[PDB]
Design a protein around this ligand. Structure first.
Ligand code: BEF
Ligand SMILES: [Mn+2]
Length: 128
């Protein structure tokens, strides 16, 4: 049943969505959907059933910081985990995402090992 947790993987670079979804599959999570920007992601989220978001930052139409802030401000999903996975590596970028409620932060390019470590840190708090 834990492995039924529903992920939304958001990035305008489809190669990154593949990498993240495939790591999830190796960890036993197959209930995974994708979105290419924050608008498409928010539309999927508002439809219900999600339990974890993994999101890029720079994307057209709505970026990942805007998405994160929207999620955190929406009482229907305000505690949804949101893992930032972004090429933006400056301390001030990390601080901004953190202050906005990010559950974790991974810099691209990444190893699957790093990504797993960050996911586990959050799972640990989900009691998984
Ligand atoms: F475009 Be992302 F923030 F790497
Ligand atoms: Mn991007």
């Amino acid at each position: 049943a834990d492995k039924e947790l529903k992920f939304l993987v958001v990035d305008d670079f489809s190669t990154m969505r593949r990498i993240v979804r495939n790591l999830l599959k190796e960890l036993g999570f197959n209930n995974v959907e994708e979105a290419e920007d924050g608008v498409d992601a928010l539309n999927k989220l508002q439809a219900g059933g999600y339990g974890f978001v993994i999101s890029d930052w720079d994307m057209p139409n709505m970026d990942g910081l805007e998405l994160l802030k929207t999620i955190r401000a929406d009482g229907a999903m305000s505690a949804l985990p949101v893992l930032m996975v972004t090429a933006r590596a400056k301390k001030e970028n990390i601080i901004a995402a953190a202050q906005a409620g990010a559950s974790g932060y991974v810099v691209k390019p990444f190893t699957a090992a790093t990504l797993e470590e960050k996911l586990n840190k959050i799972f640990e708090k989900l009691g998984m």
